[PDB]
């Protein structure tokens, strides 16, 4: 219940510029923002600090969310939009055909067993678009933008959703792709990368499989077949 002050503003500006930040960098940013603006730094009050911002951001349909990276298990903070309306559609980052390709790529990532789409698969999606066609060079430049802006993560020409993207689109994915999105059987959140039961298909986050099966004869929580993957 602090009054919002310049330390909060400085923190919000930095997070706006990054979109997403890892937890240890956020703790250091909190400290630095307090020092830059002569606010007493309290190592035990980061939640209250973020909470001040979120109270004021709530009527703007913005929030600072926390999440966990599927790969690295690290905590991330992200400034996310929380509304779909006529004003948010005025965003100027990407053209309509570019966002069509983003949506089809996201859909393939959601459908895939591995959680990654390959370069060739994205080129084939682009060639199937019903909008203005994009050349290979344009697709490659667009993918590099999606990586630079932390919507996609890219590794050796394969792409998955960035933690930032999952954090912002968590509920959008759950509702738009309810027939196909993986919902972790342990934590009940969207899983992009996962371990799947090879008998019944249910997914677990890799971190959730390590916790749930931490057991010499591990079995699927849904069909009781022995778990085929390593914990």
């Amino acid at each position: 219940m602090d009054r919002i002050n310049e330390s909060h503003q400085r923190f919000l500006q930095a997070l706006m510029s990054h979109g997403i930040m890892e937890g240890s960098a956020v703790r250091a940013l909190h400290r630095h923002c307090c020092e830059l603006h002569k606010v007493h730094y309290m190592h035990d009050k980061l939640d209250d600090f973020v909470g001040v911002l979120n109270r004021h951001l709530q009527p703007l349909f913005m929030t600072i969310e926390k999440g966990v990276g599927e790969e690295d298990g690290l905590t991330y903070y992200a400034l996310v939009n929380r509304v779909e309306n006529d004003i948010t559609k005025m965003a100027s980052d990407y053209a309509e055909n570019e966002l069509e390709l983003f949506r089809k790529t996201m859909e393939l990532i959601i459908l895939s067993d591995n959680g990654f789409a390959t370069s060739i698969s994205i080129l084939n999606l682009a060639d199937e678009l019903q909008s203005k066609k994009m050349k290979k060079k344009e697709v490659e430049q667009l993918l590099q933008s999606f990586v630079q802006e932390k919507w996609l993560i890219g590794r050796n020409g394969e792409y998955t959703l960035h933690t930032r993207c999952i954090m912002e689109l968590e509920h959008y994915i759950r509702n738009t792709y309810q027939d196909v999105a993986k919902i972790c059987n342990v934590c009940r959140k969207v899983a992009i990368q996962s371990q799947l039961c090879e008998n019944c298909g249910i997914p677990l986050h890799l971190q959730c499989a390590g916790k749930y099966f931490h057991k010499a004869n591990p079995t699927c929580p849904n069909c009781n077949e022995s778990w085929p993957h390593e914990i």
Binding site: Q13, A14, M16, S17, G19, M62, L79, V80, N81, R82, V83, E84, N85, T88, K89, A91, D93, Y94, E96, L99, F102, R103, E149, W151, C165, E168, L169, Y172
Partner: protein, 54 residues
């Protein structure tokens, strides 16, 4: 008597500040990071959810 500005001396000093024989790959970023401290620019808000038409 007016203090005349020398643009040739200026670009020589910029190149030194940027890192000298070719320019480092981060030369313009280095210059821009210095320049930001002289501006009052705001960061901008970017998102994906809600940007789709429709």
């Amino acid at each position: 008597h007016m203090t005349v500005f020398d643009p040739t001396s200026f670009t020589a000093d910029l190149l030194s500040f940027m890192g000298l024989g070719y320019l480092p790959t981060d030369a313009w970023q280095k210059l821009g990071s210095e320049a930001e401290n002289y501006f009052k620019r705001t960061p901008t808000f970017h998102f994906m959810l809600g940007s789709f038409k429709t």
